[PDB]
Amino acid sequence: AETVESCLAKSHTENSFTNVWKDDKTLDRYANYEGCLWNATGVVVCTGDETQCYGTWVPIGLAIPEYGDTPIPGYTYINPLDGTYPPGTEQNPANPNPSLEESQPLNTFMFQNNRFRNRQGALTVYTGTVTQGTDPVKTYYQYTPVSSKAMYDAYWNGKFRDCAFHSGFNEDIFVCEYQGQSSDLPQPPVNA
Numbered sequence: 001a002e003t004v005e006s007c008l009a010k011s012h013t014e015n016s017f018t019n020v021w022k023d024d025k026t027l028d029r030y031a032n033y034e035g036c037l038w039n040a041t042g043v044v045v046c047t048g049d050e051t052q053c054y055g056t057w058v059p060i061g062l063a064i065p066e067y068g069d070t071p072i073p074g075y076t077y078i079n080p081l082d083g084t085y086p087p088g089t090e091q092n093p094a095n096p097n098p099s100l101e102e103s104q105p106l107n108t109f110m111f112q113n114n115r116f117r118n119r120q121g122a123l124t125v126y127t128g129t130v131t132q133g134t135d136p137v138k139t140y141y142q143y144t145p146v147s148s149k150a151m152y153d154a155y156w157n158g159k160f161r162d163c164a165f166h167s168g169f170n171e172d173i174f175v176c177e178y179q180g181q182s183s184d185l186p187q188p189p190v191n192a
Contacts, residue, residue: 007036007059016054018067018189020046022113024128027079029053032063033191044077045183050113053077054185067188075180078150080114080125085152087145094122100130100140109163109174111151117143118164123155154178 017031017038029040031053040055047053054074088096108115108126115126123146131139146152154160163176 002035002062004061007061010034010036010059012041012059013038013057013190014042014055015057016052016185016187016189017057017191018052019191020051020053022050024126027081027114027125027127029055029077030064031057031191033057035063037061037063040077043183045074045185046077046112047072047074047185048179052185052189067192069188071184071186074183074185075112076183077112078148078154078180080116080123080146080148080151081127081144082148082150084147084149086147092145092147094145096145098127098142098144099124100132100142102138102140104141105143106168106170107166107174109160109166109176111160111163111176111178112180116146116164118155118160121155123151 013033017033019031020040021030023030029044031038036059038057039060040053041058042056044053044055085092087094105117108117117124124143125146127142127144129139130142131137155164159178160176163174166172166174
């Protein structure tokens, strides 16, 4: 059995984990292994379906409730809230306060399982929900301004022409053809 302390004391694991989850608020990557919860750090490379990621996994606490054995192709993960292009600054003038939407906006696009909104070049990313009010309680969909230079670079270089410019009353879950810089992950995942 494990405790928060036994887990925190484990050494990092540089390998691939499967059943990888993405925290909806921070967009960080997590996985369970050996009864502990781990966070992917360092250069993180994931499969297209985003279910497996290779990285320097750090145990941060207790766990929260077929594969080959050869390296497979993946894409280098970009956390769109990494702070390299911080909003509310001269560098990135975008208002830093997240946009609260009463209904999911139309024409969002998927890039590495992250849901983005493009408003004339200003990129915002879905970061879950928040509520305002108690009578009545009203849930809002939070769209946080993108703070990653890597994400904006891909956008500026035209990498999202096929997915970031849709218009109209669309029900499509647009998925971008470009999924990140190509790399590979070792196999099999250790927490299979």
